Amino acid sequence: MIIPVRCFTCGKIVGNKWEAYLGLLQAEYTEGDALDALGLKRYCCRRMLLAHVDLIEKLLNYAP
Amino acid sequence: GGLTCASAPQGTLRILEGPQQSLSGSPLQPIPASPPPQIPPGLRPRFCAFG
Numbered sequence: 001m002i003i004p005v006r007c008f009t010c011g012k013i014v015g016n017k018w019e020a021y022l023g024l025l026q027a028e029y030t031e032g033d034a035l036d037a038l039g040l041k042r043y044c045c046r047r048m049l050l051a052h053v054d055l056i057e058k059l060l061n062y063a064p
Numbered sequence: 065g066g067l068t069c070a071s072a073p074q075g076t077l078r079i080l081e082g083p084q085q086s087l088s089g090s091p092l093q094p095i096p097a098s099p100p101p102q103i104p105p106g107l108r109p110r111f112c113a114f115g
């Protein structure tokens with residue numbers, strides 16, 4: 001639904017790299033370069049953003 | 065002055081309309097076969113040890 005606040009396996013906080021991730025992808029950067037530029041070194045954190053599906057943007061479209 | 069049976073027909077013709085076959089080219093697929101999954105060029109390591 002919404003970005004997890006902390007990576008599950010480790011606990012590293014990834015809940016503040018969602019908008020930065022989206023901004024570096026709009027600038028032309030690959031998902032690899034983008035996840036690198038955010039400080040997500042170990043692949044347990046990289047999967048936390050790489051495979052996130054933001055469904056809070058589709059629920060926030062039905063009437064109040 | 066009536067109609068009488070005449071001589072038996074000597075043959076029969078059966079007509080049908082038929083078109084012909086073209087050359088065998090056998091063009092199986094636009095982009096054919098199962099194209100293989102493959103390596104992204106260079107790639108580079110996306111991880112390092114500590115120290």
Ligand SMILES: [Zn+2]
Nearest residue numbers: 007010044045
């Ligand atoms: Zn992690």
